[PDB]
Amino acid sequence: MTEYKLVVGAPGGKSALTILIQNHFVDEYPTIEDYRKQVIDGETCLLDIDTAGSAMDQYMTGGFLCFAINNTSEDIHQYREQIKRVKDSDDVPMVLVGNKCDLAARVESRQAQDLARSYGIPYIETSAKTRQGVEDAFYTLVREIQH
Amino acid sequence: MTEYKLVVGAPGGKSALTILIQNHFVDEYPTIEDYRKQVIDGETCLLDIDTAGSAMDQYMTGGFLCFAINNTSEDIHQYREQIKRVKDSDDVPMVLVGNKCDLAARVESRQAQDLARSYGIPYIETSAKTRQGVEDAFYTLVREIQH
Ligand SMILES: C[C@@H](OP(=O)(O)OP(=O)(O)OP(=O)(O)OC[C@H]1O[C@@H](n2cnc3c(=O)[nH]c(N)nc32)[C@H](O)[C@@H]1O)c1ccccc1[N+](=O)[O-]
Ligand SMILES: C[C@@H](OP(=O)(O)OP(=O)(O)OP(=O)(O)OC[C@H]1O[C@@H](n2cnc3c(=O)[nH]c(N)nc32)[C@H](O)[C@@H]1O)c1ccccc1[N+](=O)[O-]
Ligand SMILES: [Mg+2]
Ligand SMILES: [Mg+2]
């Protein structure tokens, strides 16, 4: 079976979201080679999923998941350009995820969606406490991988 | 505010899915100009949504939602080509939805995803009884409208 190998960004909830496999919210503190899960729109697939926040180029075999909106975590741009180095390609399947859209004092969503447009990818807001958007990420990245 | 004007296909649950606005399942029998709803990934939008199953060209102002998998409802192809006549365009924001993926004796999902690829759009399976996929449709069509 097809292997949906897809988590990246700055330091500050990349884990929590992936913690889809665990259906529960970590407020706790593992972040290095860290998941597998057995359908999406009726196609039966496995996933290989979490990076921490130099050369470990090594791992980006990869779709990319790639900030949490109370933090103007500029840093996405960086990630995205390091992958265009290794991957060597101006299009690689990918989702811009704004996490922690639950919280009050926050990044106004437009900003992002206009960068999103400027890379030409998904932009999906998301929240591992409330679940709101957890899987919306993952599952639109798969469907990408038309690629 | 931006107006997310998006339901189409053959006769045989286009309504039920739209019935997002009503969060409940119709097994009952209205199908002609039939919804509005006030966020998606943190962008605050309204929707204007249901067609029945000649010239009423009139309505496809439109994103297109466009079969229910126990019915080999061939008919998507037709829809999709009538819109490339009116809309005049080989790319128009759009989601291929396989509805009623709940049911037992069913269209094998691959088939579709390979047509999907062959048009270059989303293909999302979906189910208004179980909710599974209701909003997955709607909300990925919006994000399309990068267009
Ligand atoms: C070491 C490095 O760790 P890191 O691995 O770079 O950090 P992660 O990106 O994995 O982030 P993690 O999933 O550990 O969650 C971080 C914190 O934000 C909270 N959080 C995550 N998602 C949400 C959400 O949607 N809502 C809310 N309200 N909070 C959320 C978590 O519960 C947690 O307290 C790291 C670097 C800098 C700062 C922290 C940090 N860390 O791991 O704590
Ligand atoms: C007149 C024309 O009507 P139509 O408007 O072309 O038909 P719709 O596409 O709007 O279809 P509708 O939403 O009315 O649902 C049709 C039937 O399939 C069921 N259904 C819809 N979604 C699901 C689902 O995900 N799961 C299950 N198990 N069943 C589902 C409904 O509960 C209902 O009994 C029409 C044409 C032909 C046949 C029927 C038909 N009709 O309206 O009944
Ligand atoms: Mg971590
Ligand atoms: Mg109807």
Coordinates of C-alpha atoms and ligand atoms in Angstrom, one line a residue:
Chain A
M1 CA 0.0 0.0 0.0
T2 CA 0.9 3.7 -0.8
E3 CA 2.8 5.4 1.8
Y4 CA 1.7 8.8 2.8
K5 CA 4.9 10.1 4.1
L6 CA 4.2 13.6 5.4
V7 CA 5.8 18.1 10.4
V8 CA 7.9 21.3 10.4
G9 CA 8.3 24.9 11.4
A10 CA 9.9 27.0 14.2
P11 CA 10.2 26.1 18.0
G12 CA 7.0 27.3 19.9
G13 CA 2.9 23.0 18.7
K14 CA 4.0 20.9 15.8
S15 CA 3.8 17.9 18.1
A16 CA 0.4 18.4 19.5
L17 CA -1.3 18.3 16.3
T18 CA 0.4 15.0 15.3
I19 CA -0.4 13.8 18.7
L20 CA -4.4 12.7 14.9
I21 CA -2.7 9.4 16.1
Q22 CA -3.3 9.9 19.8
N23 CA -6.8 12.0 19.6
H24 CA -5.7 13.8 22.8
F25 CA -4.0 17.0 23.8
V26 CA -0.5 17.2 25.0
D27 CA 0.4 20.1 27.2
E28 CA 3.2 17.9 28.5
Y29 CA 6.7 17.9 27.0
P30 CA 9.5 13.8 22.7
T31 CA 10.8 15.8 19.7
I32 CA 13.4 14.1 17.4
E33 CA 12.6 11.0 15.3
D34 CA 9.2 11.0 16.3
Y35 CA 4.2 8.1 13.9
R36 CA 2.3 5.5 12.0
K37 CA -1.3 5.3 11.3
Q38 CA -3.6 3.2 9.3
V39 CA -8.5 5.9 5.1
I40 CA -8.9 9.3 3.5
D41 CA -11.8 9.9 1.1
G42 CA -12.0 6.1 0.8
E43 CA -8.3 5.3 0.1
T44 CA -6.7 3.1 2.5
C45 CA -3.4 4.4 3.4
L46 CA -0.7 4.5 6.0
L47 CA 1.1 7.5 7.3
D48 CA 4.6 8.1 8.3
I49 CA 4.6 11.3 10.3
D50 CA 7.6 15.5 14.0
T51 CA 10.7 17.5 13.8
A52 CA 12.2 19.5 16.5
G53 CA 12.1 23.3 16.3
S54 CA 21.9 21.6 10.8
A55 CA 22.4 18.9 8.3
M56 CA 19.6 16.6 9.6
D57 CA 18.6 18.1 4.6
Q58 CA 18.9 14.3 5.7
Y59 CA 15.2 14.0 6.6
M60 CA 13.4 16.5 4.2
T61 CA 12.6 11.5 1.7
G62 CA 9.5 13.8 2.3
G63 CA 4.9 16.3 1.7
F64 CA 5.6 19.1 4.0
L65 CA 3.7 20.3 6.7
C66 CA 5.0 23.7 7.7
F67 CA 3.6 28.7 12.8
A68 CA 1.3 29.5 15.9
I69 CA -0.5 32.7 15.3
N70 CA 0.4 34.5 18.6
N71 CA 3.9 34.9 17.1
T72 CA 5.0 37.0 14.4
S73 CA 7.5 32.0 14.2
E74 CA 8.8 35.0 9.8
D75 CA 10.4 31.6 10.3
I76 CA 8.0 29.7 7.9
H77 CA 9.7 31.5 5.0
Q78 CA 13.0 30.0 6.2
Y79 CA 11.7 26.5 6.3
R80 CA 10.2 26.7 2.9
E81 CA 13.4 27.9 1.3
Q82 CA 15.6 25.2 3.0
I83 CA 13.3 22.5 1.4
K84 CA 13.5 24.2 -2.1
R85 CA 17.3 23.5 -1.7
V86 CA 17.1 19.8 -0.9
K87 CA 14.1 18.9 -2.7
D88 CA 15.5 21.1 -5.5
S89 CA 11.9 22.2 -6.6
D90 CA 9.8 25.2 -6.7
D91 CA 6.7 22.9 -6.3
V92 CA 6.6 20.2 -3.7
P93 CA 3.2 19.1 -2.0
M94 CA 2.8 21.3 1.2
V95 CA 0.4 22.9 3.7
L96 CA 0.9 26.2 5.4
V97 CA -0.7 25.7 8.8
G98 CA -1.5 28.5 11.2
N99 CA -1.8 26.6 14.6
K100 CA -3.4 27.7 17.8
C101 CA -6.3 29.7 16.2
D102 CA -8.3 29.0 19.5
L103 CA -6.5 31.5 21.6
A104 CA -7.6 35.1 22.0
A105 CA -4.7 37.5 21.6
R106 CA -3.2 36.6 18.5
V107 CA -1.3 37.0 13.0
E108 CA -4.5 38.2 11.2
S109 CA -5.4 35.3 9.0
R110 CA -5.4 37.4 5.7
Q111 CA -1.7 38.0 6.0
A112 CA -1.0 34.4 5.7
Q113 CA -3.5 33.4 3.0
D114 CA -1.8 36.2 0.8
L115 CA 1.7 34.6 1.5
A116 CA 0.0 31.3 0.8
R117 CA -1.2 32.6 -2.5
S118 CA 2.3 33.9 -3.0
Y119 CA 3.8 30.4 -2.6
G120 CA 0.7 28.7 -4.2
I121 CA -0.2 26.3 -1.5
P122 CA -2.8 25.5 1.1
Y123 CA -3.1 27.6 4.2
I124 CA -5.1 25.9 7.0
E125 CA -5.8 27.1 10.6
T126 CA -5.8 24.5 13.1
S127 CA -6.0 23.6 17.0
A128 CA -4.9 20.4 18.9
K129 CA -6.6 21.5 22.1
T130 CA -10.0 21.9 20.5
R131 CA -9.3 19.5 17.6
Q132 CA -10.7 22.2 15.2
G133 CA -8.5 21.7 12.0
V134 CA -6.2 18.8 13.2
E135 CA -6.9 16.5 10.4
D136 CA -7.8 19.2 7.9
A137 CA -4.1 19.7 7.6
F138 CA -3.1 16.2 7.1
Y139 CA -5.8 15.0 4.8
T140 CA -5.5 18.1 2.3
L141 CA -1.7 17.5 2.1
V142 CA -2.3 13.8 1.0
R143 CA -4.6 14.8 -1.8
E144 CA -2.0 17.1 -3.1
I145 CA 0.7 14.4 -3.3
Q146 CA -2.2 15.3 -8.2
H147 CA 1.6 15.5 -7.8
Chain B
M1 CA -17.3 41.0 3.1
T2 CA -16.1 38.4 0.5
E3 CA -18.8 36.3 -0.8
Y4 CA -18.2 32.6 -1.1
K5 CA -20.6 31.7 -3.7
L6 CA -20.4 27.9 -4.2
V7 CA -24.1 22.3 -5.5
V8 CA -24.4 20.1 -8.6
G9 CA -24.5 16.7 -10.2
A10 CA -27.0 14.0 -11.3
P11 CA -30.5 13.2 -9.6
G12 CA -30.0 10.5 -6.8
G13 CA -28.0 13.7 -2.1
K14 CA -26.7 17.0 -3.2
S15 CA -29.3 18.6 -0.8
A16 CA -28.5 16.6 2.2
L17 CA -24.9 17.6 2.4
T18 CA -25.9 21.4 2.1
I19 CA -28.6 20.7 4.7
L20 CA -23.7 22.3 6.9
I21 CA -26.4 25.0 7.4
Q22 CA -28.9 22.8 9.1
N23 CA -26.3 20.2 10.9
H24 CA -29.0 17.5 10.5
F25 CA -29.9 14.8 8.1
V26 CA -32.7 14.9 5.7
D27 CA -34.3 11.7 4.5
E28 CA -37.3 13.7 3.7
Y29 CA -38.0 15.3 0.4
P30 CA -37.1 21.5 -1.8
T31 CA -34.8 21.4 -4.9
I32 CA -34.8 24.5 -7.1
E33 CA -33.5 27.9 -5.9
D34 CA -32.5 26.7 -2.8
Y35 CA -28.7 28.9 1.6
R36 CA -26.7 31.5 3.5
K37 CA -24.3 31.1 6.3
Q38 CA -22.0 33.2 8.2
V39 CA -15.3 31.4 9.3
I40 CA -13.0 29.2 7.5
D41 CA -9.3 28.9 8.6
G42 CA -9.9 32.3 10.4
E43 CA -11.6 34.2 7.5
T44 CA -14.9 35.5 8.1
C45 CA -17.1 34.8 5.2
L46 CA -20.6 34.3 4.1
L47 CA -21.9 31.6 1.7
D48 CA -24.3 31.5 -0.9
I49 CA -25.1 27.9 -1.6
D50 CA -28.7 23.4 -4.4
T51 CA -29.6 22.6 -7.9
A52 CA -32.1 20.0 -8.9
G53 CA -30.8 16.8 -10.6
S54 CA -32.2 23.2 -19.9
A55 CA -31.1 26.8 -20.1
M56 CA -31.2 27.5 -16.3
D57 CA -26.3 28.2 -18.1
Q58 CA -28.3 31.0 -16.2
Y59 CA -27.1 30.0 -12.8
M60 CA -23.6 28.4 -13.4
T61 CA -22.4 33.6 -11.5
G62 CA -20.7 30.6 -9.8
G63 CA -17.1 27.5 -7.5
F64 CA -18.6 24.2 -8.3
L65 CA -19.5 21.5 -6.3
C66 CA -20.1 18.5 -8.5
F67 CA -22.1 11.6 -7.5
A68 CA -23.2 8.9 -4.8
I69 CA -20.9 6.0 -5.0
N70 CA -23.6 3.2 -5.3
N71 CA -24.2 4.5 -8.9
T72 CA -22.0 4.1 -11.7
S73 CA -24.5 9.1 -11.6
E74 CA -20.9 8.9 -15.7
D75 CA -23.0 11.9 -15.2
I76 CA -20.3 14.1 -13.5
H77 CA -18.4 14.3 -16.8
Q78 CA -21.5 15.8 -18.3
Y79 CA -21.8 18.5 -15.7
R80 CA -18.2 19.4 -15.8
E81 CA -18.3 19.9 -19.6
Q82 CA -21.6 22.1 -19.5
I83 CA -19.7 24.4 -17.1
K84 CA -16.6 24.6 -19.4
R85 CA -19.1 26.0 -21.9
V86 CA -20.6 28.8 -19.9
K87 CA -17.8 29.6 -17.7
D88 CA -15.7 29.3 -20.9
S89 CA -12.6 27.9 -18.9
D90 CA -10.6 24.9 -18.6
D91 CA -9.9 25.9 -15.0
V92 CA -12.7 27.0 -12.6
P93 CA -12.5 26.3 -8.8
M94 CA -14.3 22.9 -8.2
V95 CA -14.6 19.8 -6.0
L96 CA -15.4 16.3 -7.1
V97 CA -17.4 14.8 -4.3
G98 CA -18.2 11.2 -4.0
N99 CA -21.2 11.2 -1.5
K100 CA -22.6 8.4 0.5
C101 CA -19.3 6.7 1.3
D102 CA -21.1 5.3 4.5
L103 CA -23.0 2.6 2.8
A104 CA -21.9 -0.9 2.3
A105 CA -22.5 -2.0 -1.3
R106 CA -21.0 0.5 -3.4
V107 CA -17.5 3.1 -7.2
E108 CA -14.1 2.1 -5.9
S109 CA -12.5 5.3 -4.7
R110 CA -9.4 5.0 -7.0
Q111 CA -11.4 5.3 -10.1
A112 CA -12.5 8.7 -9.1
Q113 CA -9.2 10.1 -7.8
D114 CA -7.7 9.1 -11.2
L115 CA -10.5 11.0 -13.1
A116 CA -9.9 13.8 -10.5
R117 CA -6.3 13.8 -11.4
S118 CA -7.3 13.8 -15.0
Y119 CA -9.4 17.0 -14.5
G120 CA -6.9 18.4 -11.9
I121 CA -9.3 19.0 -9.0
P122 CA -10.1 17.9 -5.5
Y123 CA -11.9 14.6 -5.1
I124 CA -13.5 14.4 -1.5
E125 CA -15.7 11.5 -0.2
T126 CA -18.4 12.7 2.1
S127 CA -21.7 11.6 4.1
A128 CA -24.6 13.8 5.3
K129 CA -26.1 11.0 7.5
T130 CA -22.8 10.5 9.4
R131 CA -21.5 14.0 8.9
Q132 CA -18.1 12.4 7.8
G133 CA -16.8 14.8 5.0
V134 CA -19.7 17.3 4.9
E135 CA -17.7 20.4 5.4
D136 CA -14.5 18.9 4.0
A137 CA -16.1 19.6 0.6
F138 CA -17.2 23.2 1.1
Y139 CA -14.2 24.5 3.0
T140 CA -11.5 23.0 0.4
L141 CA -13.6 24.6 -2.5
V142 CA -13.3 28.1 -0.8
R143 CA -9.5 27.9 -0.4
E144 CA -9.4 27.1 -4.1
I145 CA -11.3 30.3 -5.1
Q146 CA -5.6 31.0 -5.2
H147 CA -7.9 31.5 -8.1
Ligands
LIG1 C1 11.5 22.7 22.9 C2 10.7 23.3 21.7 O1 9.9 22.2 21.3 P1 9.2 22.0 19.8 O2 9.2 20.6 19.5 O3 9.9 22.9 18.9 O4 7.7 22.5 20.2 P2 6.5 21.9 19.3 O5 6.4 22.8 18.1 O6 6.5 20.5 19.2 O7 5.3 22.4 20.3 P3 4.5 21.3 21.2 O8 3.6 20.4 20.5 O9 5.4 20.7 22.2 O10 3.5 22.4 22.0 C3 4.1 23.6 22.5 C4 3.2 24.3 23.5 O11 2.2 25.0 22.9 C5 1.0 24.4 23.3 N1 0.1 24.2 22.1 C6 0.2 23.4 21.0 N2 -0.8 23.4 20.2 C7 -1.7 24.3 20.9 C8 -3.0 24.7 20.5 O12 -3.5 24.6 19.4 N3 -3.5 25.5 21.5 C9 -2.9 26.0 22.6 N4 -3.6 26.7 23.4 N5 -1.6 25.6 22.9 C10 -1.1 24.8 22.0 C11 1.3 23.0 23.8 O13 0.2 22.5 24.6 C12 2.6 23.2 24.5 O14 2.5 23.8 25.8 C13 10.0 24.5 22.2 C14 10.7 25.7 21.8 C15 10.3 26.9 22.3 C16 9.2 27.0 23.2 C17 8.6 25.8 23.5 C18 9.0 24.6 23.0 N6 8.4 23.5 23.7 O15 8.5 22.2 23.2 O16 7.6 23.8 24.8
LIG2 C1 -36.0 14.3 -7.3 C2 -34.5 14.1 -7.3 O1 -34.0 15.0 -6.4 P1 -32.5 15.6 -6.4 O2 -32.5 17.0 -5.8 O3 -31.9 15.4 -7.7 O4 -31.9 14.7 -5.2 P2 -30.6 15.2 -4.3 O5 -29.4 15.0 -5.1 O6 -30.9 16.6 -3.7 O7 -30.7 14.1 -3.1 P3 -31.3 14.4 -1.7 O8 -30.4 15.2 -0.8 O9 -32.7 14.7 -1.8 O10 -31.1 12.9 -1.1 C3 -31.5 11.8 -1.9 C4 -31.7 10.5 -1.1 O11 -30.4 9.9 -0.8 C5 -30.3 10.0 0.6 N1 -28.9 10.4 1.0 C6 -28.3 11.6 0.7 N2 -27.1 11.7 1.3 C7 -26.9 10.4 1.8 C8 -25.8 9.9 2.5 O12 -24.7 10.3 2.6 N3 -26.1 8.6 3.0 C9 -27.2 7.9 2.7 N4 -27.3 6.7 3.3 N5 -28.2 8.3 2.0 C10 -28.0 9.6 1.6 C11 -31.2 11.0 1.2 O13 -31.4 10.8 2.6 C12 -32.4 10.8 0.3 O14 -33.3 9.8 0.6 C13 -34.2 12.6 -7.2 C14 -33.9 12.0 -8.3 C15 -33.8 10.6 -8.4 C16 -33.9 9.9 -7.2 C17 -34.1 10.6 -6.1 C18 -34.3 11.9 -6.1 N6 -34.8 12.4 -4.8 O15 -34.7 13.8 -4.5 O16 -35.2 11.5 -3.8
MG3 MG 7.8 18.7 19.6
MG4 MG -32.4 18.2 -3.8

